[PDB]
């Protein structure tokens, strides 16, 4: 069986995916999201979310859905043979539109674990009392990125580890660290200058970092792992532009878990008898946001992806991870309890916070053909089984049949069930993750020059639509 | 069937004597993938389906079902009446079923 | 059902003249005279019908006589017959024996030529299949026991019910047809039905203004404005005020005809057998 | 890799011109029409239940055509070819006269006759059950295939985890598919439902179907299965009209909505039962409308299986409600008396059925190439296991050490010898298994269906007298 | 509550017709013999034609 032997190495998609000269334009309309920047406003009695968390420090992982090209109808009839070939989309252009004005938005904690300002201290103050927390706010480090792949991105953060079963651990001991790899989901917080760490687990204090990140994981994209994966599916190309400087040098109150060795200093006297806390922490500050340093609102043409998957959108899917903290202005809107008053009163006005993001994604796809011979079939199967399976290529009808029984009123009583509880067939394993599912099944258009990215692509390629009107040019 | 204090339908009404008007929905042929697609120019042509054949399957066994009213307005059987009946009092209704 | 094609809710305040099946309903008969005389022949281009009935029992009606018998139609009696019995007769209908031979269904119907001018063209990507079948109306009577302990039958122990189950399965063979829209054909189609052209194309520099709609995420929450169904969209089906049994065949099309009973029936009718791949037979 | 799109048997199955005739001698069956008789202490069946409304699902067993010794086997090569039987003709002979038998219940849940009521029904009491009989719906059918048929009926399902079920609630329905077996009751005009579960009354339908499951053949699913094995031929006739219109008795489980009628007063204050049921009746039976006693030539099957009897098997399902005459017997307890006494005679019921099947089988050769082998293996694996070809012998030899004195107490226990034969996948089902292994004959001229086939094909017999 | 004297009963019947014809034009060369024959058949025919 199988005259050829399995290919032992990963080959580039330029070897079995044949590219055609048919291009399509797809685009979302305009994606808005209003919410609270620091926490979700839940009900006092129920835990239904009334105003969700929509901040500028969040990952925005869009899960683009493309139409199945094995069920389309291009200006052809039988250009592809459905018994030997199968079609697939290849992303050849992207543009991540952004809507709101540039700006920086601060956050903070009403009770932040800050002892004193160790930047320029006047003298030696007494030791910490009880509940030495202040209300401190800070603007985070500035970040922009754009990951594009056909599989979800992959983050990294420091979590808590399980200490070896040889040490005797006492309460209050330092939790061991371990670098955890997790898929980035829409709504994960991007690191802010305090590190890529688990803040719920590693800081039981709940009072060291600001409100938006005090009980959440801050992840960083694992480029080392994402570019070194064999098939290169989760990263076609990426951009990143981070910047930060330390604004204020602070301290941290609490029991010194690990004391300064008596070798590194000379024992003091008087007011300097007990060492001030040497758990320093800086306040990040992402500096000036400018318009010339923007990653977005520009077209990005994929000439050659980083890995071996050269932009092929396997499984009719595509992921656009987007972070930018350069449009993160929280709008401060208030309301009046009574309009009858003619003087001012701090107890008369109830203040609120909001944040509104605006996106608009446009793409340019190119139809591709994969003539599924024997060895190409074995390769596509070993790379990803659900690829070769979710288009039913090498399958006969099973001897049983697929005659469903559908009831016309499936909510009513006295028909046995809703009849579809178990997710047995075609359930993508991303059941568990939450993305900004974008449905581009009704948005493809072969009229390229009618859309802004379409005519940008036409310019870059050097083409133009054939004239509908006769002479009169220029 | 509906629970009296609410107004939600628990069991709908499904008799043999109703119209079954099906509203089929066909795929848009101008957005389809055929063996070949460039057979019709999208700028001066359009596609459409035509019904060439149809078959309405039916599953249950043959049979006649009967219905009726628990209080049906009948006075007397006038097919063959032995003699003159009495006079109509109040509420002379009867329970009578019939195959349609 | 044998009681006329009338509106029983408004024409009979008695609420007791016809069975519970059509006590407050409207009994409608297909208007063949009007559906056939339609200019374009869209509403129907193929139909079958069987209907049989005989008068089983002959009855009377109780109530105040609405129109008296004219006194020159009968000779006045005296005694018991001094007051007239009600002459408002109504027959109890009866559809006779059902048979497997007289069946209209479970058979393929090849629409070779339609009745009107629309020769089977499903305009607007739409098809309507109206079906009445009073030959499978068996109502299954089923009961439940409120007490499984009792070993003596008691009418107050068993609760009786009535049920009915329909089973359908529709199969079609569609044919792709192409229409070259010149000026003449375009104006003729715009005269026939403007929605046809308004649904494809051919005249729309779509707006002069943008048509980009900005959709919100988490649109159930109370942090935004009013994002729920308030302004309408091109959602306007002209048949939205009507309730049909919807059937979505958008994902059920298949060019492998010989894989389905009606597909290979159509092949066998047209000859047109599939090409044998397996060597020699 | 291999293939899609199930293909007709006319592509890999090559026909020959060798025809054989096989036929059962005569199949008789006597019994009781309503219920099976059994001893009080035991449960051995003394007189089975042989009704005219049961399915007769014959499982025919054909001889393996690969172990036929043909004189010149040079027409097929057992190294690369295998043989199979194709059913070309069939006749389902019926023996008894035309007649209609009736069934009933001594305690049937019937309140009154609501066809034409002379006055509003009086009070309802306890146990208004009557003794009512009825002749059922008329039915004939004959399904033939290489797999058992598939039936359909409505059954009780489990309700959701949403509604609190009170005692006496209506059981939810569900269309359940099953294999039709020999002795399953055909639908009789009361529907295709599970009367054991859906009616705890045990008094709503007559005696022979009050505990049974009336099934209907599922043609929608049998013709739509991919390979077309369950049936490749079927005929059916069925007629029924409503003879009488009745009423039910019991606590009304669903009240009539108050906006359908106008409340009564006095005699008509309590609503009479609105649960109706008609008694079916299959009218005149005729010899002109007979499906059976006729030869059927299976030229073009309905599916892709053009009459190939895979696995040397054939299932003939038959319903004949046209010869359901139940004969009423009687025995005298004492043969001395000179005066009639009802206590002197023991009344009985008996029903006798009579069948006679005949088939004309055509021999066909399947040349097993690689793709034909893969296709047949995907379609059915027990085919390529029944025919010695696949499963090439993976392992090698291994010593078993064969202890000499196995029943001694100086060694361990040598016991193994474990397996009982495990072959039959259709062992759970009950069919009227017909064995045609010693009944094949190449002399079609000598059998009635054989000479009918010869006459229909032309092909007169070779002359022997000058 | 239902009362017989509360409801008046009537009977009605409605017919529905639709007549369609296909007519063909015919010419009659009115010679002497044809005119005499039509005058013997029906003279109002020869009258309504003036």
Numbering used by the authors:
A (entry chain A): 12 to 485
B (entry chain F): 52 to 151
C (entry chain F): 203 to 483
D (entry chain B): 16 to 481
E (entry chain E): 354 to 403
Please give sentences taken from the publication describing this entry.
Human papillomaviruses are non-enveloped, circular dsDNA containing viruses with capsids comprised of 360 copies of the major capsid protein, L1, and an uncertain number of the minor structural protein, L217,18. Five copies of L1 intertwine to form each of the 72 capsomers that make up the T = 7d icosahedron. L1 takes the form of the ubiquitous jellyroll of anti-parallel beta strands (BIDG and CHEF), which are connected by flexible loops that extend outward from the surface of the capsomer and constitute the majority of the L1 hypervariable regions. The asymmetric unit is comprised of six L1s, five of which make up a single hexavalent capsomer and one L1 that contributes to a pentavalent capsomer.
Quasiviruses were used throughout the work described here. In this study we used a subparticle refinement approach that allowed us to overcome the previous resolution barriers in HPV structural studies. The high resolution capsomer maps were recombined into an icosahedral capsid with 3.1 Å resolution overall (ISECC_recombine), a dramatic improvement over the original 4.5 Å map. The recombined map allowed the full asymmetric unit of HPV to be unambiguously built for the first time. For the six chains of the asymmetric unit (chains A–F) there was strong continuous density stretching from Tyr12 to Arg485 (A), Val16 to Phe480 (B), Met1 to Phe480 (C & D), Leu3 to Gly483 (E), and Met1 to Gly483 (F) respectively. The improved resolution of our map when compared to the previous 4.3 Å structure (Guan et al.) allowed us to correct the 36 residues making up the C-terminal arm extensions (402–439). The pentavalent and hexavalent L1 capsomers share a common core architecture but have different connecting arm structures (residues 402–439). The connecting arm extends from the base of the donor capsomer, looping into the neighboring capsomer to make a disulfide bond between Cys428 of the connecting arm and Cys175 of the neighboring capsomer, and then returns to the donor above the initial extension. The most compact conformation was in L1 chains A and F, whereas in chains D and E the conformation was the most extended, with chains B and C exhibiting an intermediate structure. The second, larger putative L2 density, approximately six amino acids, was found flanking an L1 loop region that extended from Ser306 to Ile327.
